[PDB]
Amino acid sequence: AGHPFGTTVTAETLRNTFAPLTQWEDKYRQLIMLGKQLPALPDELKAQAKEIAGCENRVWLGYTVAENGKMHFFGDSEGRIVRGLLAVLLTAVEGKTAAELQAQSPLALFDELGLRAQLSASRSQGLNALSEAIIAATKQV
């Protein structure tokens, strides 16, 4: 269930890493490299994840809550770009209480990385679906 995002990889290392990349294709590649750091979710735990759907790809997204209220998220995806975008989202949300996550948008980091400006429109529906799954999970907790 475990992954590096939030712990060994953070919003500020993503920011420092993406900031130099001015060619958008370099952002794209960084996005893909980032998603290769996401470990494979075994079919076992894809079943305990809610299936979220964009316009081209599926993502799986689960969560647990420690007793101190912190939420651990986990997920997987088949497309490499979508694995990158999911890694960015996990970096944004991992380790936060339900209270802390209803404070800003889950997708603010995608803007901060310069990623939204050039992604296809179709991505926005999957991103927005991810955002509302997070919002919904904080509602359940």
Author numbering: 7 to 147
From the reporting publication:
In order to shed light into the consequences of oxidation inactivation of the redox-sensitive sulfur acceptor CsdE, we determined the crystal structure of a disulfide-bridged CsdE dimer at 2.4 Å. We used single-wavelength anomalous diffraction at the selenium absorption edge (Se-SAD) to phase selenomethionyl-labeled CsdE crystals that diffracted to 2.95 Å, and performed phase extension in nearly isomorphous native CsdE crystals to 2.4 Å. The final model contains nearly all CsdE residues except for the first 7−8 amino acids, which were disordered. It consists of a two-layered α/β-sandwich with a central three-stranded antiparallel β-sheet (βA-βC), surrounded by seven α-helices (α1-α7); the reactive sulfur acceptor Cys61 is located at the tip of an extended β-hairpin between βA and βB. The disulfide bridge has a favorable stereochemistry and is well defined in electron density maps. In the disulfide-bridged dimer, the two CsdE subunits are related by a pure rotation around an axis running parallel to the CsdE long molecular axis through 141°. The fifth largest interface, at 393 Å2 or merely 5.4% of a monomer’s ASA, includes the disulfide bond that creates this inactive CsdE species. However, in the disulfide-bridged CsdE structure this secluded orientation is obviously not possible; instead, the loop containing Cys61 has turned around to expose the thiol sulfur atom for disulfide bond formation. Indeed, the dimeric Cys61 conformation is roughly halfway between the fully protected and the completely exposed conformations, thereby representing an intermediate state. A remarkable observation made in the CsdE dimer is that, while Cys61 presents a fully exposed state as in persulfurated (CsdA-CadE), helix α7 is essentially unchanged with respect to the free forms of CsdE, and it is only slightly tilted to make way for the outward-going Cys61 loop.
